Amino acid sequence: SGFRKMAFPSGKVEGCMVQVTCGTTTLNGLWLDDVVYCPRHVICTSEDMLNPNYEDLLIRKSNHNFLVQAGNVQLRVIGHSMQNCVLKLKVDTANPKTPKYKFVRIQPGQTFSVLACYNGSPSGVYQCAMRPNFTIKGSFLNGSAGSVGFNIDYDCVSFCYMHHMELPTGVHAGTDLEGNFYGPFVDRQTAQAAGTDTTITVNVLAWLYAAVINGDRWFLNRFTTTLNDFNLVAMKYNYEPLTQDHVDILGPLSAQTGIAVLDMCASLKELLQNGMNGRTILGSALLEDEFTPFDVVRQCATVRLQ
Amino acid sequence: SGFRKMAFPSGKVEGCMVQVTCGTTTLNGLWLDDVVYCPRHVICTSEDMLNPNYEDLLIRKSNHNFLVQAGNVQLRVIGHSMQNCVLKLKVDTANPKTPKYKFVRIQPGQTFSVLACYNGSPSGVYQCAMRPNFTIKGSFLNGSAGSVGFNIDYDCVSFCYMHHMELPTGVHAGTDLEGNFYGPFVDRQTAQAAGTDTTITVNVLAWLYAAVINGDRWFLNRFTTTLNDFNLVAMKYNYEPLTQDHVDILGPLSAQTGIAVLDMCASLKELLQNGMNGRTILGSALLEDEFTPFDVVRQCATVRLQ
Ligand code: NA
Ligand code: NA
């Protein structure tokens, strides 16, 4: 059947993307109902990014200072609002292509689809994960601010991310659709420490469960370990600690196979201590931490009634 | 910054995805103008799949024997014709969401975006490359036939692939939108095998250039080798030879980096001889053959006006 990291079909999100222009700075905005959400720094000037006083800058701006465009049609702005680090532009027209949407804040280790846009036009879509240090290993160039991260559940598009900035390490940071930054970051061009980026342990365990189902099982031991002992070893090897919520997520895969979560944890604990030493798991010498138990269950090959 | 295997936005393709049902078997269909394209084995029963007489089966089929549904709306089939391995169903309505499009036959080593659909409804989008043996290492389940692969240039959607079946090895095969299969395969449940799967070397060279872009160069040498010598060494391993066209495609990468293409070839040549099996930490991270030079160029910052 094959395993592939998949983004959700972006057609619903592409219908809410508009161009927001302020001065000579143009970047993307999210048009839902009669509100357009965009990053704050559209109002910023070149010299005023080290420590912008956004509230003072916003007052000097007016409604006609913002140009919102959706294709050949231009949208008229009736008001501007600052919700944390996100600018809310009320327009005179509701988006007819507005889908059933809800705003969600995701936890580290979860995945979502990113629609990278430039000048208001969608350019590409990719799947990524929220790193434990609240960064994302995305692919963004200058002008990609305003791109949104999302997940589609049935018919409801659950928006969870908006891109703002790129850190010096090369990773990217942003806010939820309510303007609150993921992690201890601010939208200022000043030195900011992201913190150590640990490996998503729950996704690695799901990867190991996928390997066991597909036949890769050289790395298994009959031993079981306590959660405390595994968490101690995991942090010594820069693995994110395993919580009760992570174990609950791993429940379906552990039941589909015969391996208890702490049984698999003992296998991974000895894996970390000894290394892979020439052996490969699922065809790679490295482990995957951005493939979720959701992804494994939906894409795994099943038995065949003959 | 940041490199990610990105797929083209699937909105334009999403608007052409319909559900084609013949008897009890249901597949996906591509609705362009007043014609719906779908795999022809939709007319097959549970039997008639080991060795089908597609001409005989389709001659017995009637126009009302096909049920085409787009959302809740159901389209009437006014005509049916066979184009090689693909069924062309003329419907009573031209698709109003039809984009500017053309039918393209890709070459091995090139990439495109797959929109996986089930029951005519889009489910996920991922990027993949045509393997040297004309197979696809995709993620497909039963009922995914009719899913299409595409590339987007401006507003023109270049359809290049429609998924049909899965080989016992787990890889997938399909046809162009003209019904002609990619590879020596046929749409029959018979014993078929793909050719030797080799590494698309021009893509790994592009991957190495991206690693240089990210600031990692501790696996390069200052040596240069001729193309003929590299190809002999490369062909001894399971690597495809470099054509002059491949070098020309790699030219922009060399210009942006200052590393000669043959310089990078010698670096790869030395790595292979020293035992880069693709089974070590440095081999499994540097050996990626599904990231084209265009992807590296399209995700890089060019000359920067300061
Ligand atoms: Na164990
Ligand atoms: Na070299």
Residue numbers in the entry:
A (entry chain B), B (entry chain A): 1 to 306
What is written in the article reporting this PDB entry?
The main protease of SARS-CoV-2 (Mpro, also referred to as 3-chymotrypsin-like protease or 3CLpro) is responsible for the majority of nsp processing, cleaving at 11 conserved sites along the polyprotein including self-excision of Mpro by autolytic cleavage of its own N-terminal and C-terminal autoprocessing sites. SARS-CoV-2 Mpro is a functional homodimer of two symmetrically disposed protomers that are each 306 residues in length (33.8 kDa). The active site of Mpro features a Cys145-His41 catalytic dyad, which orchestrates nucleophilic attack at the carbonyl carbon of the invariant P1 glutamine and the formation of an acyl enzyme intermediate central to efficient peptide cleavage. Using C-terminally substituted Mpro chimeras, we have determined X-ray crystallographic structures of Mpro in complex with 10 of its 11 viral cleavage sites, bound at full occupancy intermolecularly in trans, within the active site of either the native enzyme and/or a catalytic mutant (C145A).
Finally, C7, C9, and C13 (all in the context of C145A) have crystallized as rings composed of seven dimers. These all belong to space group C2 with C7 and C13 having seven monomers (half a ring) in the ASU and C9 (C145A) having 14 (complete ring). Notably, the large 14-mer ring structure composed of seven dimers has been observed from three distinct C-terminal variants crystallizing in different conditions. Analysis of the crystal packing with PISA27 shows the main interface between dimers ranges in surface area from 800 to 1000 Å2 with the ring assembly as a whole predicted to be stable. However, we do not observe evidence of these in solution and oligomerization appears to occlude free access to the active sites for external substrates suggesting that barring some negative regulatory role or inactive storage form, the oligomers observed are likely crystallographic rather than physiological interactions. Primarily small beta-branched residues, threonine or valine, are observed at P3, with C8, C9 and C10 having extended side chains with significant aliphatic character (lysine, arginine or methionine).
